[PDB]
């Protein structure tokens, strides 16, 4: 009982508040997210796979803000500060991740449970 390797958890829905970090006048996190990583404009007639949008963290400023909040490499961010990113645009998303009204972005993300352990899994 308790944890069974080989069985997909599909998507762990967890909330994580990741806060931008001090770089002088800059408050920023320094991790990277892909909204488009493996896609194109041509899917939007369907939104990729319906409401997909293809938003997924592809890196992290390690030992920094995101990951300490509870973020890691390979995470699908669905919303920030409670703002469903799926129906909104990447620039719109950019706005509410890094404006001057927060100090932190509260995320609705989807975990695989396969956190940082450097697993080289690459399939094209």
């Amino acid at each position: 009982m308790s944890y069974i390797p080989g069985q997909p958890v599909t998507a762990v829905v967890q909330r994580v508040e990741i806060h931008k970090l001090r770089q002088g006048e800059n408050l920023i996190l320094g991790f990277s997210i892909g909204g488009g990583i493996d896609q194109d404009p041509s899917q939007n007639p369907f939104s990729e796979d319906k409401t997909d949008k293809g938003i997924y963290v592809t890196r992290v400023s390690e030992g920094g803000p995101a990951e300490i909040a509870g973020l890691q490499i390979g995470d699908k961010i669905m919303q920030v500060n409670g703002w469903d990113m799926t129906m909104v645009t990447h620039d719109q998303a950019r706005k509410r991740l890094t404006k001057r009204s927060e100090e932190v972005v509260r995320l609705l993300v989807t975990r695989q449970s396969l956190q940082k352990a450097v697993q080289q899994s690459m399939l094209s």
């Binding site: 931008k20 920023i28 996190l29 320094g30 991790f31 990277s32 997210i33 892909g34 909204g35 488009g36 990583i37 493996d38 896609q39 194109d40 404009p41 041509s42 899917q43 939007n44 939104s47 990729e48 949008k53 293809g54 592809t58 890196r59 990447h90 950019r94 991740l97 890094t98």
Partner: peptide, 8 residues
């Protein structure tokens, strides 16, 4: 929708 990534 399309390929665009960003650090923040």
């Amino acid at each position: 929708k399309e390929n665009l990534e960003s650090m923040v």
